[PDB]
Design an enzyme around this catalytic site. Structure first.
Site, PDB file in Angstrom:
ATOM      1  N   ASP A 258     -10.892   5.062  15.808  1.00 28.56           N
ATOM      2  CA  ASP A 258      -9.515   5.113  16.274  1.00 28.56           C
ATOM      3  C   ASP A 258      -9.296   5.191  17.772  1.00 28.56           C
ATOM      4  O   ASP A 258      -8.211   4.866  18.248  1.00 28.56           O
ATOM      5  CB  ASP A 258      -8.831   6.302  15.607  1.00 28.56           C
ATOM      6  CG  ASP A 258      -9.110   6.360  14.123  1.00 28.56           C
ATOM      7  OD1 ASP A 258      -8.500   5.561  13.377  1.00 28.56           O
ATOM      8  OD2 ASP A 258      -9.952   7.190  13.708  1.00 28.56           O
TER       9      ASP A 258
ATOM     10  N   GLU B  79     -13.739   8.913  15.760  1.00 20.25           N
ATOM     11  CA  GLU B  79     -12.981   8.868  14.528  1.00 20.25           C
ATOM     12  C   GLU B  79     -11.974   9.993  14.754  1.00 20.25           C
ATOM     13  O   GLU B  79     -12.341  11.080  15.198  1.00 20.25           O
ATOM     14  CB  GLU B  79     -13.874   9.166  13.321  1.00 20.25           C
ATOM     15  CG  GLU B  79     -13.088   9.348  12.035  1.00 20.25           C
ATOM     16  CD  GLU B  79     -12.254   8.130  11.681  1.00 20.25           C
ATOM     17  OE1 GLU B  79     -11.288   8.276  10.901  1.00 20.25           O
ATOM     18  OE2 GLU B  79     -12.564   7.024  12.178  1.00 20.25           O
TER      19      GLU B  79
ATOM     20  N   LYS C  16      -8.850  12.415  13.177  1.00 20.01           N
ATOM     21  CA  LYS C  16      -8.194  12.965  11.997  1.00 20.01           C
ATOM     22  C   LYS C  16      -7.167  13.994  12.451  1.00 20.01           C
ATOM     23  O   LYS C  16      -7.430  14.802  13.344  1.00 20.01           O
ATOM     24  CB  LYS C  16      -9.237  13.640  11.103  1.00 20.01           C
ATOM     25  CG  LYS C  16      -9.529  12.942   9.783  1.00 20.01           C
ATOM     26  CD  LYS C  16      -9.743  11.446   9.929  1.00 20.01           C
ATOM     27  CE  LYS C  16     -10.229  10.853   8.617  1.00 20.01           C
ATOM     28  NZ  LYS C  16     -10.008   9.382   8.512  1.00 20.01           N
TER      29      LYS C  16
HETATM   30 PR   LIG Z   1     -10.096   6.119  11.395  1.00 21.02          PR
END
Ligand SMILES: [Pr+3]
Ligand SMILES: [Pr+3]
Lengths: 151, 154
Positions: free
Chosen positions: A52, A62, A64
């Protein structure tokens, strides 16, 4: 109230202006206004919708997020399998904790801090006869306990 | 890490006030589902939003159907994905509020009465029976039509 809008809008447009500069086209959709806070605090750059974001050194992450008032577990992937896990293993994870629309804390976990879950799910996949696990959650207590607190 | 962070800190108190204002008007999150956009419409029109048919109501108990579009992405207001004579019958009972945004800011707001939309209702109804009692897939109302037949409230 309509008076409040006249007094508040100028600042809202400026926030959107800032958002645009960082690749967020609409702060009022898909948590746009929330993601921006994480980006500015952490100094990351968003990536097109896998990983991301990325830092200035080219390291992909990544990301979250969680609304602490609604849930206590970060989601992963609805169709968890070894292919996805293999990808997850390659990058550090950024965990953002919000309360309403405000960022409360941010933690970073290295791959080695998540191996525990990676190994567990991977073994699960093969033991249950190649069955995809439905969005396994990662306890907020775990991230707070094993990650580095960036904010 | 970003120098822009400073800007964020200066602006935050105002963003939080905006969210606070949204809560008093029944919008849970300004950063989701166009929350911050819908709030502008409510504050300008003085309408009260309705829990997830009709979408808002005024102080006199008159309910309204509310549609919106981003003039930058499209020029036609959506209606319903499975509309038939029943959906049309519901639509005919209330006036409609059309909100036009440009990005995140409202650009204009128009109101049409049932009489201003019968032109479309009759056409869609007839088509339902003609094509053999088959639901019409979200027919649209052009923006020019709302601009020519509606009362400009904003
Ligand atoms: Pr992702
Ligand atoms: Pr509706």
């Amino acid at each position: 109230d309509l008076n409040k809008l006249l007094e508040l809008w100028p600042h809202i447009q400026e926030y959107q202006d800032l958002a645009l500069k960082h690749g967020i086209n609409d702060i009022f959709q898909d948590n746009g206004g929330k993601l921006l806070q994480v980006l500015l605090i952490t100094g990351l750059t968003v990536l097109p919708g896998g990983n991301d974001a990325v830092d200035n050194a080219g390291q992909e992450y990544e990301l979250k997020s969680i609304n602490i008032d609604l849930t206590k577990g970060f989601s992963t992937h609805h169709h968890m399998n070894p292919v996805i896990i293999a990808k997850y293993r390659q990058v550090p994870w950024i965990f953002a904790i919000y309360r309403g629309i405000a960022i409360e804390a941010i933690y970073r976990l290295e791959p080695k801090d998540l191996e525990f879950y990676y190994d567990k799910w991977e073994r699960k996949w093969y033991s249950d006869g190649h069955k995809d696990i439905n969005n396994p959650k990662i306890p907020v207590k775990y991230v707070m306990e094993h990650g580095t607190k960036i904010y």
